[PDB]
Amino acid sequence: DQICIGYHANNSTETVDTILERNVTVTHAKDILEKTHNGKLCKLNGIPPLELGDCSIAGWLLGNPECDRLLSVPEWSYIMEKENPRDGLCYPGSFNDYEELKHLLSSVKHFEKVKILPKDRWTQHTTTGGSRACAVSGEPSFFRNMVWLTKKGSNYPVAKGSYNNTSGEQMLIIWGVHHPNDETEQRTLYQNVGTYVSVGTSTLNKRSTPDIATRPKVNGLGSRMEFSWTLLDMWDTINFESTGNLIAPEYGFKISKRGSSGIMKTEGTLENCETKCQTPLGAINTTLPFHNVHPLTIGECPKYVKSEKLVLATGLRNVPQILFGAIAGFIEGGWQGMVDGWYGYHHSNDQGSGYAADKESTQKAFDGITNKVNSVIEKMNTQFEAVGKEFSNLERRLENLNKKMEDGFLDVWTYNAELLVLMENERTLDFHDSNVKNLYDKVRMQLRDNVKELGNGCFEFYHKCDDECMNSVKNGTYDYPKYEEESKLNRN
Amino acid sequence: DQICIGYHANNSTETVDTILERNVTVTHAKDILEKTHNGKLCKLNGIPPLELGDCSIAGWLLGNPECDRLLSVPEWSYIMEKENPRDGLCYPGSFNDYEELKHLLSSVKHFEKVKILPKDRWTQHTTTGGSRACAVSGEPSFFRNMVWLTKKGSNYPVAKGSYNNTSGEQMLIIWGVHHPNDETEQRTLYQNVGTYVSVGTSTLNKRSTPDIATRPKVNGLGSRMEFSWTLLDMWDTINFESTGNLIAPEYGFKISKRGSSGIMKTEGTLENCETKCQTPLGAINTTLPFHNVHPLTIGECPKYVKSEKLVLATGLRNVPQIAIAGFIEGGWQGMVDGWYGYHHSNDQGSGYAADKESTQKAFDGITNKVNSVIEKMNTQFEAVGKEFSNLERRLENLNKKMEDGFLDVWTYNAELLVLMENERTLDFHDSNVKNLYDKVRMQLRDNVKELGNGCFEFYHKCDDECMNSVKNGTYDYPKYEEESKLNRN
Amino acid sequence: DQICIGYHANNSTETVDTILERNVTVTHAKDILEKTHNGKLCKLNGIPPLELGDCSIAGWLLGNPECDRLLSVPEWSYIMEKENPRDGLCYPGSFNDYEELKHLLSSVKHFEKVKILPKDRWTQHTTTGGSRACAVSGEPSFFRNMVWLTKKGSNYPVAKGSYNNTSGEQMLIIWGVHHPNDETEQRTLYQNVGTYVSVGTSTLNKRSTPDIATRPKVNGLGSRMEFSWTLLDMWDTINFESTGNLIAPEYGFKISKRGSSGIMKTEGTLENCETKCQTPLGAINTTLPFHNVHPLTIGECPKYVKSEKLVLATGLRNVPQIIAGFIEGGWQGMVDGWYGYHHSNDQGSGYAADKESTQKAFDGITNKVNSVIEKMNTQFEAVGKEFSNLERRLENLNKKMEDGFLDVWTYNAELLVLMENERTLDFHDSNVKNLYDKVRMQLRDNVKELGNGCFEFYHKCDDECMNSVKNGTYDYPKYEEESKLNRN
Ligand SMILES: CC(=O)N[C@H]1[C@H](O[C@@H]2[C@@H](O)[C@H](O)O[C@H](CO)[C@@H]2O)O[C@H](CO)[C@@H](O[C@@H]2O[C@H](CO[C@]3(C(=O)O)C[C@H](O)[C@@H](NC(C)=O)[C@H]([C@H](O)[C@H](O)CO)O3)[C@H](O)[C@H](O)[C@H]2O)[C@@H]1O
Ligand SMILES: CC(=O)N[C@H]1[C@H](O[C@@H]2[C@@H](O)[C@H](O)O[C@H](CO)[C@@H]2O)O[C@H](CO)[C@@H](O[C@@H]2O[C@H](CO[C@]3(C(=O)O)C[C@H](O)[C@@H](NC(C)=O)[C@H]([C@H](O)[C@H](O)CO)O3)[C@H](O)[C@H](O)[C@H]2O)[C@@H]1O
Ligand SMILES: CC(=O)N[C@H]1[C@H](O[C@@H]2[C@@H](O)[C@H](O)O[C@H](CO)[C@@H]2O)O[C@H](CO)[C@@H](O[C@@H]2O[C@H](CO[C@]3(C(=O)O)C[C@H](O)[C@@H](NC(C)=O)[C@H]([C@H](O)[C@H](O)CO)O3)[C@H](O)[C@H](O)[C@H]2O)[C@@H]1O
Ligand SMILES: *[C@@H]1O[C@H](CO)[C@@H](O)[C@H](O)[C@H]1NC(C)=O
Ligand SMILES: *[C@@H]1O[C@H](CO)[C@@H](O)[C@H](O)[C@H]1NC(C)=O
Ligand SMILES: *[C@@H]1O[C@H](CO)[C@@H](O)[C@H](O)[C@H]1NC(C)=O
Ligand SMILES: *[C@@H]1O[C@H](CO)[C@@H](O)[C@H](O)[C@H]1NC(C)=O
Ligand SMILES: *[C@@H]1O[C@H](CO)[C@@H](O)[C@H](O)[C@H]1NC(C)=O
Ligand SMILES: *[C@@H]1O[C@H](CO)[C@@H](O)[C@H](O)[C@H]1NC(C)=O
Ligand SMILES: *[C@@H]1O[C@H](CO)[C@@H](O)[C@H](O)[C@H]1NC(C)=O
Ligand SMILES: *[C@@H]1O[C@H](CO)[C@@H](O)[C@H](O)[C@H]1NC(C)=O
Ligand SMILES: *[C@@H]1O[C@H](CO)[C@@H](O)[C@H](O)[C@H]1NC(C)=O
Ligand SMILES: *[C@@H]1O[C@H](CO)[C@@H](O)[C@H](O)[C@H]1NC(C)=O
Ligand SMILES: *[C@@H]1O[C@H](CO)[C@@H](O)[C@H](O)[C@H]1NC(C)=O
């Protein structure tokens, strides 16, 4: 009669990496890293994003004639923008604090356009002016959200405008100043030289003077237009005053919804699909804690890491046993007939052979491994990860600072995850061997000298053991005093 | 005769966490997180703070009439300010590089006010101007540290003033420029239009022109005042020149003491107490690696982690149940002398004991373990706090992301370290008990008989001296050889 | 006849650290931190650096008469500069966006010079101005790369100038505006009051007005000069216009080579040596992952930490024996392996060693060391950044970021080394005990354990017997009858 102790082996080919060995075959493994995406841009939470196409943020807000599809925009989840948009500032010029405006637009999910200074109120000036830089059907045109004030007759009276924010929320207002190319243009358009543009609110005070000089021609013009913005608070007034070179606003943008969003730089188009996490390459439909698709992401998303594989070993080592002899134990290798658990027995008494499994040790090890996996997974913080920021070309030091901070944090977390996986894999691999040896030691200690240790994990008895005795050994209820006299006689 | 190997147990309730099992009761434990405070604002190292009250830093430095108790201020440790103070710039306006000034004030612990430009030297101008936005008992007043210069008669001559820094340290000087509401105010205050204000030092050059326009009324006035500042070095000179719209300084703030300080944003009042670490909610009296009270602390304080529990297992696992059994059946609730030990049952009488060697080495190892976890933590002075304007949102976001990421890194590090360390400690105790059992078996050989419950049943009658020998490591197998062999057969 | 299981011991005095114990003597150890350096400033990859000496970047780029040796600088790898250079802006003034220029200079490597506005083109102005601040051999002089335009006779016509960037790469252009001290100076130099200087490119639009005021005297002058720069793109044009107070450029700086470079603040001189990693204190010749010389480095350089010691245990504990086995201590006679045996039969005694266990342990330790070393990424880092007096918050932010990352890495390295040392020292004991258990399991009941790690045989075990026991092919049935007879 025999009784042996061993573990479970199968035909799995999965491999894991530990700290002292690489490419170790395991029975079961878990992948906590996702590397796949659908390669499409979709709807977030059911709300489609805003597709700017070839337009830019400045072109959308100012009202470029090539951006007439965005004159009435519904609620959005994120903004899609190209790297180098073609239709932006049709009239050559600049845009002060552009990056700050783009950053503000990363927490706004809806705008409401309100007419604050109607065009017909300028009854002492000329409001129908344009340029061939922004041309519709050949004839010159202008921005659809701004008014160009020129002289009426042969005089330019002082232009005064005001607006009291009785809308209900913060309002965004944009104005501009025109810089001519020669004194001829200035005297043809505004009738006087030495003009000023003054804009004032409760917490704002600005006075700009036009610059007239010969400049290189961009879009066929040697002139420029400088744009500035402000955020008017509730129950607050904005005052405009100018002697010349004022590009007045007709519309003001009211922040109607607020939340978390961002600007995604991509060259693709939207497709009919839904998702909960959006990368510039495609959506992610996952429950795993990590991914390595793209750093920048919008929505609740797994952490990024510069890794190619991260596998957690949740099973035993796969060492298979290699003439109608006696089945060995855990010393030689695993068993392929034990399919009901991880650790078990094998009896060879008179009433047939057969395998079995020990439920207590298997349950304990399963609970421990599940707890380890859940501790690794669930001690990671997940939130909104809008990590897109823009910097001008006078802000190289700030851009380098942001790049270094992001790279350092990403490298730190990569190191953390990789080393954690390595140590945990080694610890679980040693755990399984410790458990098997502990079960063997318990069996030997409870069986005492009634048996004969064979040296390969098996126990040759000294008495005749029935299935009742075998289950007693498995149950840990073996009655040593009962068989003492019988076993002692056959020993010598 | 019987000898057994076991471990000590008690009636504890403290629970630790292990990466494999949660809620494991332990005999001893060490909490390395502090979660309490006194809820009061106290004195840092015996020096009281500067309680601004309803005043702002601009109001304190400019001389707001409602902050007359701050004209002379002693040495301080930190500044207490409200989130939205009331008495700031009584005259509506702005302040250039306000956040830079507030950051500079974070390393200054005392100021000395020096009269650098008296009011009586302006003998060619009028220096009694005032406004009703800054009013005392109904009549108009003005800032106490500044002079408003106005025409004397019907003339405003060119105003010139210079100062040489012979005080002995760096000096802070604040001036201002007035922006009227209409040309009428400009002409009845300064007699001419097209004025300038020029300030020049060895490393500074600034020229400003007033802006006259209609603005929404704040505090009743459509005018504004714009203030600037500079840091004058030792043995350096500052020049002032203006044809109008100049608010000249009367006093300068010399930096008398330097060090580490900060601005704490609270709404409370100072009380009578001492401390070493201060938080906006209260003071901390602790000597532990970690705390979870408030992020923005002033002083040498433990790192902040978003953890509600961080307990290091120092003692053994608590299995209460134990003739008498050994370590397989569980722990002993009667061995109150040490950690590992024995239990003998010879004919003289039963009794417990303790193994001094194993207990001492385990104690030293656990002590070194705890001290390595604790004394690897840099704790220097850091007054975490910075202010940004409404046009510096990107910088504010960068700073917030930096602090949040560092905090998350440190919480993950601490939690993982505690979990793995506790697992290793419990495994260490189990291994030590097993090693003691194995050593006893190895030295005791076949003269005894294992029972499977951790105990050994001898074959020779063993007295007290023999038992102290087997606990000593000086057991003599050959002497009990023939006697032991006889009865075993 | 005996066979024993033991481990190696020697006369080393190395010491490692562990999470449970400190000052542990080991047979073999590896130091993974380098604390030594050459002490000299060398050539990076065979290319010598740029030695500014007593000059500043502004002085080099403007043409300070004292810096007359840097008019034709060759290719370089990094720039050496002093903390407080002496020869800089000889004429007192400022330099707008100076730190941005210094940041841009950390990625260029040659800076070819191109004459864009030759001085002879100004036929309607006087171009021979100078000052005693920048005085050579007593007589007044001026910057060698700049032109000071004054009036000719009693007129100052409008000054215009253009340059189309057809060089083949980006260019750097610097101009200036002069601020006088009084109206007498302004009328003596430019003949008109109320002047302006206008500069315009396809993406720049700046207009400046002179400031006339009395200022403290620096270098004997109460007047100042303000300098600004721009980066002209390819096939772009820059326009200059002024009615006075213009310091026009004569040269432009075309970027010829781009790559990784930097600025080092040192007070030393270049010495004849070659290196690949350079610190402000010296050079590093290394094969080790770590170093604790100086935070700021240029080149292929190791990682930096606040660590005074980082030693990885690659061997056994040194517990020499005062023939016993592994219970007492190591053997000072086993010179061919980590774990081994010692036997004594009627041929003779002698030590030996195991091959499989020693090889497995060697491979495991080597893999551990290589994993610790090779998971640390390295790359070129431009740590050095400079900030102005009104950017204290940004400077503090940068300092806090660098310090925090560096303490994080220091803590990680320390904990990794401590836990790995504990793991190795437990691994060795586990391996020796596993060998002992394997031998006992194979040898069964035909022998007699003696407690110290040795086995006393019950039969007469010869040399072929002993190699069989070492091999793992011990025949239990062959000696079963003989062993059982004498045991009874
Ligand atoms: C309205 C118009 O066509 N003006 C042109 C100007 O005309 C003079 C007219 O005002 C006067 O009464 O009579 C004389 C003849 O006796 C002229 O006809 O003449 C200029 C040259 O002589 C033209 O200059 C050219 O303008 C180009 C630009 O056209 C646009 C543009 O595409 O930007 C469009 C409009 O003409 C105009 N917008 C208005 C008036 O509201 C803008 C305007 O010039 C902006 O200030 C841009 O600079 O220009 C090119 O700029 C070209 O380089 C220039 O020679 C006038 O178009
Ligand atoms: C000094 C004074 O009372 N000025 C008031 C001004 O009167 C003139 C006086 O200077 C002249 O000699 O004679 C005429 C009569 O022939 C006046 O009496 O009249 C203004 C109305 O027309 C008042 O304006 C109002 O001022 C308000 C603010 O008043 C104060 C203030 O408390 O801020 C009063 C101060 O005395 C005055 N002067 C100084 C030197 O600080 C300041 C000054 O105007 C500031 O510079 C304000 O920018 O103003 C309100 O602003 C109100 O809206 C306005 O109508 C003059 O008070
Ligand atoms: C060219 C010259 O010698 N100018 C000095 C000036 O003289 C006049 C001359 O131009 C006119 O035709 O005739 C009168 C007599 O009828 C004068 O001879 O007189 C000034 C004092 O009265 C001197 O002033 C001093 O200049 C110092 C600086 O000298 C330099 C310098 O080294 O920086 C000399 C340069 O030649 C001069 N000119 C140019 C074109 O660079 C510069 C120039 O003044 C700078 O722009 C200064 O902002 O200055 C000191 O500045 C000292 O404080 C001052 O009194 C003139 O040197
Ligand atoms: C482990 O596998 C990887 C890829 O499967 C291979 O590159 C590497 O050489 C393997 N390791 C060894 C020790 O062969
Ligand atoms: C703006 O409107 C609100 C509400 O109608 C009013 O209280 C406030 O006085 C108005 N502003 C001004 C400057 O009158
Ligand atoms: C996305 O994942 C969910 C699991 O929550 C699954 O039910 C659904 O079918 C998946 N959709 C696609 C398109 O893969
Ligand atoms: C551990 O105990 C806490 C209460 O002390 C309980 O909230 C938690 O669910 C328990 N966890 C487990 C795994 O039993
Ligand atoms: C300021 O005072 C110091 C010492 O009294 C003196 O050396 C210096 O020349 C003075 N400054 C000026 C501009 O005279
Ligand atoms: C135990 O060992 C110590 C060795 O220092 C010895 O002095 C003592 O007598 C021993 N005890 C007994 C009972 O032999
Ligand atoms: C240690 O032993 C080696 C033998 O290889 C010898 O060369 C060396 O000098 C010895 N060192 C000391 C300090 O005894
Ligand atoms: C123990 O280690 C410390 C370094 O932490 C060292 O200064 C000291 O000399 C060492 N002592 C011994 C006895 O090795
Ligand atoms: C500058 O030169 C380029 C040559 O490629 C030419 O295309 C361009 O028109 C020139 N610029 C101007 C303003 O003519
Ligand atoms: C640098 O170290 C290497 C060893 O890795 C050595 O071969 C070489 O000669 C050394 N060079 C110098 C200049 O020290
Ligand atoms: C030991 O094993 C080797 C296997 O490489 C074999 O060649 C040799 O004959 C064996 N020796 C004995 C004595 O079994």
Nearest to B70 by CA among B88, B87, B51: B51
Ligand 11 atom 2, closest CA: C23
Phi/psi of residue C124, nearest 5 degrees: -110, 15
**CA–CA min distance B43, chain A (Å):** 36
Q: Do C202 and A218 touch (CB under 8 A)?
A: yes
Per DSSP bridges, beta strands C224-232 and C93-95 are: parallel
Please tell me if residue A99 touches chain B, with a CB cutoff of 8 Å. yes
Per DSSP bridges, beta strands C263-265 and C79-81 are: parallel
Distance CA C352, CA C279 (A): 49
C-alpha distances in Å from residue C279, one per residue of C40, C297, C304: 9, 5, 12
Distance CA A358, CA C446 (A): 33
Q: Do B94 and A239 touch (CB under 8 A)?
A: no
Nearest to C421 by CA among C291, C269, C317: C317
Please tell me if residue C397 touches chain B, with a CB cutoff of 8 Å. yes
Distance CA B316, CA A214 (A): 85
If one counts every other C-beta atom within 10 angstroms of the C-beta of residue C157, the result is: 10
Phi/psi of residue B61, nearest 5 degrees: -80, -25
Tokens of residue A146, six digits: 């701004």
Question: Chain A residues with CB inside 8 Å of C376's CB?
Answer: 415
The reply to whether ligand 5 has any atom less than 6 angstroms from the CB of B349 is: no
Q: Give the chain C residue whose CA is nearest to the CA of B398.
A: C397
The DSSP code for A150 is B
Q: Smallest Cβ distance to B378: which of C396, C407, C418? A: C407
Distance CA A278, CA A290 (A): 14
Q: Do C405 and A400 touch (CB under 8 A)?
A: no
Ligand 4 atom 5, closest CA: A23
CA of B237 to the centre of ligand 3 (A): 24
Distance CA C440, CA C326 (A): 14
Distance CA C173, CA B183 (A): 43
Q: First and final CA of chain A: distance in angstroms?
A: 18
Distance CA A237, CA A227 (A): 20
A129 burial (CB, 10 Å; 0-12 / 13-18 / 19+) is middle
Distance CA C286, CA C350 (A): 42
- Residue by residue, DSSP assigns A258-326 as E----EEE-S--EEEEEES-B-SS-B----SSEE-S-S--BSB-PEE-S-S--EEE-S-B--B------
**CA–CA min distance A455, chain C (Å):** 5
> For the sheet containing C303-304, what is the strand order?
C33-34, C290-291, C303-304
Ligand 4 atom 2, closest CA: A23
Distance CA A192, CA A155 (A): 9
Phi/psi of residue A350, nearest 5 degrees: -65, -40
Q: Do B372 and C418 touch (CB under 8 A)?
A: yes
Tokens of residue B324, six digits: 């008498």
Experimental method: cryo-EM
Helix A396-447 with A359-378: angle, nearest 10 deg: 170
Q: First and final CA of chain C: distance in angstroms?
A: 18
Ligand 14 atom 3, closest CA: C471
Please tell me if residue C485 touches chain B, with a CB cutoff of 8 Å. no
Q: Do C207 and A215 touch (CB under 8 A)?
A: no
Pocket test for ligand 4, best of A22, A25, A311 (most atoms within 8 A of CB): A22
Tokens of residue B282, six digits: 């209260």
Q: Which of B243, B424, B427, B474 to mutate to test the interface with C (most CBs of C within 10 A)?
A: B424
Which amino acid would we find at residue B443?
Q
Distance CA C57, CA C108 (A): 14
Q: Do B214 and A231 touch (CB under 8 A)?
A: no
Phi/psi of residue B152, nearest 5 degrees: -105, 105
What is residue C266's three-state secondary structure? coil
Distance CA C14, CA C20 (A): 18
Distance CA C230, CA C104 (A): 11
CB C197 within 8 A of CB C226: no
The reply to whether ligand 4 has any atom less than 6 angstroms from the CB of A22 is: yes
Chain-centroid distance of CA B485 in Å reads 71
Paired with A258 in beta bridges are: A108
Pocket test for ligand 3, best of C221, C226, C245 (most atoms within 8 A of CB): C221
CB A332 within 8 A of CB A455: no
Distance CA A343, CA C109 (A): 66
Which amino acid would we find at residue B348?
Q
Report resolution (Å) to 1 decimal.
Answer: 2.6
| A378-382 contacts at long range (C-beta below 8 A, 24 or more positions apart) | A379/B412, A379/B415, A379/B416, A380/A289, A380/A303, A380/B412, A381/B408, A382/A300, A382/A301, A382/A302, A382/A303
Q: Do B412 and A100 touch (CB under 8 A)?
A: no
Distance CA B183, CA B213 (A): 9
The reply to whether ligand 1 has any atom less than 6 angstroms from the CB of A375 is: no
Q: Which domains does chain A have, with CATH numbers?
A: 2-33+309-491 (3.90.20.10), 50-268 (3.90.209.20)
Distance CA B133, CA B89 (A): 10
| Ligand 2, atom nearest to B140 Cα | 32
**CA–CA min distance C121, chain A (Å):** 20
C-alpha distances in Å from residue A256, one per residue of A81, A122, A262, A316, C284: 22, 29, 17, 57, 60
Nearest to B224 by CA among A159, A204, A195, A162: A204
Question: Residue length, chain C?
Answer: 488
| Ligand 9, atom nearest to B468 Cα | 13
Q: Which of C203, C260, C422, C485 to mutate to test the interface with A (most CBs of A within 10 A)?
A: C203
Distance CA C481, CA B394 (A): 88
Question: Chain C residues with CB inside 8 Å of B231's CB?
Answer: 389
C-alpha distances in Å from residue C340, one per residue of A10, A455, C335, C349: 35, 21, 10, 14
Q: Give the chain C residue whose CA is nearest to the CA of A456.
A: C441
Please tell me if residue A205 touches chain B, with a CB cutoff of 8 Å. yes
Distance CA C451, CA A36 (A): 59
Distance CA A344, CA C434 (A): 23
Question: Chain B residues with CB inside 8 Å of A412's CB?
Answer: 409
CB A37 within 8 A of CB A281: yes
Ligand 12 atom 14, closest CA: C164
Distance CA A229, CA A224 (A): 17
Rg (C-alpha) for chain A, rounded Å, is: 38
Question: Chain B residues with CB inside 8 Å of A208's CB?
Answer: none
Element (H, E) at C362: helix C356-374
Phi/psi of residue A186, nearest 5 degrees: -65, -45
A107 burial (CB, 10 Å; 0-12 / 13-18 / 19+) is middle
The DSSP code for C119 is G
**A163-199 per-residue burial string, b: 16 or more CB within 10 A, e: under 16:** bebebeebbbbbbbbbbbbeeeebeebbbeeebbbbb
Question: Chain B residues with CB inside 8 Å of C214's CB?
Answer: 200, 239, 241
Q: Do A19 and C405 touch (CB under 8 A)?
A: no
Q: Do A239 and B215 touch (CB under 8 A)?
A: yes
Tokens of residue A38, six digits: 């659908």
Torsion of the alpha carbons at C167, C169, C170 and C171, rounded to the nearest 10: -30
CA of C334 to the centre of ligand 10 (A): 15
Q: First and final CA of chain B: distance in angstroms?
A: 18
If one counts every other C-beta atom within 10 angstroms of the C-beta of residue A312, the result is: 22
B476 burial (CB, 10 Å; 0-12 / 13-18 / 19+) is exposed
Q: Give the chain B residue whose CA is nearest to the CA of A410.
A: B405
Nearest to B199 by CA among B177, B169, B224: B177
Question: Chain A residues with CB inside 8 Å of C207's CB?
Answer: 211, 213
Please tell me if residue A403 touches chain B, with a CB cutoff of 8 Å. no
Q: Smallest Cβ distance to A20: which of C236, C367, C412? A: C367
Paired with B80 in beta bridges are: B51, B264
3-state secondary structure string across chain B = CEEEEEEECCCCCCEECCCCCCCEEECCEEECEECCCCCCEEEECCECCEECCCECHHHHHHCCHHHHHHCCCCCCCCEEECCCCCECCCCCEEECCHHHHHHHHHHEEEEEEEECCCCCCCCCCECCCCEEEEEECCEEECCCCEEECECCCCCCCCEEEEEECCCCCCEEEEEEEEECCCHHHHHHHHCCCCCCEEEECCCCEEEECCCCCCCCCECCECCEEEEEEEEECCCCEEEEEECCCEEEECEEEEEEEECCCCEEECCCCEEEEEECEECCCCEECCCCCEECCCCCCECCCCEECCCCCCEEECCCECCCCCCCCCCCCCCECCCCCCCEEEEEECCCCEEECCCHHHHHHHHHHHHHHHHHHHCCCCCCCCCCCCCCCCCCHHHHHHHHHHHHHHHHHHHHHHHHHHHHHHHHHHHHHHHHHHHHHHHHHHHHHHHEEECCCCEEEECCCCCHHHHHHHCCCCCCCCCCCHHHHHHHC
Element (H, E) at A189: helix A183-189
Q: Do C239 and A218 touch (CB under 8 A)?
A: no
Q: Smallest Cβ distance to A200: which of B22, B215, B398? A: B215
Chain-centroid distance of CA C284 in Å reads 9
B319 burial (CB, 10 Å; 0-12 / 13-18 / 19+) is middle
- Residue by residue, DSSP assigns A4-43 as EEEEB--S---EE--SS-SSEEBS-EEE-EE----S-EEE
